[PDB]
Amino acid sequence: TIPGNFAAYHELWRNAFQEIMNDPRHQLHRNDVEYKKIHAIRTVLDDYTKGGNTWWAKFRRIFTFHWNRHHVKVVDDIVKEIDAGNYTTSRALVDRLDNLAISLGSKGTLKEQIGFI
């Protein structure tokens, strides 16, 4: 309930993100063009990096956690990746989001959970 490492925070975040993307108010269909999906995801991620006042109010709790600051910085980098044109499918975008907490070395999926993918 209080995430004790960055991966645990990301797991809470994934659950929230999935709920938000499945919100009926997006009016997203799985046969929509990919640009429409990617843009809706980008809007939600952007709102997340700006304090979550539009889409993340229900999950206001996560913004107080220690891990939020760094996680917001990583999501901000991904929004930049969207803006740079790195994603042509929403599937690839949510895979990036899925796996953002893992790293190489040492010191189901989001696709399946989201209806329009």
Side-chain angles (χ1 to χ4, degrees), residues 1-106 108-117:
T1 186
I2 299 291
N5 51 68
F6 185 76
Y9 176 94
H10 181 56
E11 176 64 25
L12 295 185
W13 183 92
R14 286 204 321 135
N15 299 334
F17 172 74
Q18 166 270 145
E19 192 182 320
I20 292 163
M21 292 322 305
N22 282 315
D23 192 305
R25 297 195 312 274
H26 287 296
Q27 302 285 350
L28 281 175
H29 180 269
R30 57 189 211 153
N31 287 137
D32 275 316
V33 295
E34 290 303 306
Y35 166 84
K36 186 169 178 213
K37 300 177 189 183
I38 290 172
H39 188 65
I41 293 169
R42 188 208 179 278
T43 304
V44 169
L45 300 179
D46 195 37
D47 178 55
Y48 176 66
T49 67
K50 294 166 153 68
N53 299 311
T54 302
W55 290 98
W56 298 78
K58 166 173 181 156
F59 305 98
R60 169 67 178 85
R61 166 87 85 93
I62 68 183
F63 291 93
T64 70
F65 293 153
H66 179 69
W67 313 106
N68 175 260
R69 177 172 160 137
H70 182 69
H71 191 273
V72 160
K73 174 248 161 192
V74 179
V75 172
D76 194 78
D77 291 343
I78 294 168
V79 172
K80 209 185 124 161
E81 289 173 9
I82 297 166
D83 288 341
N86 287 295
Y87 302 99
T88 61
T89 74
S90 56
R91 171 179 317 100
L93 181 46
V94 300
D95 276 339
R96 174 80 170 94
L97 291 167
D98 225 342
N99 293 295
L100 72 78
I102 67 179
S103 58
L104 302 164
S106 48
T109 67
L110 228 36
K111 294 193 249 67
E112 280 137 51
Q113 293 183 51
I114 293 181
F116 59 82
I117 303 197

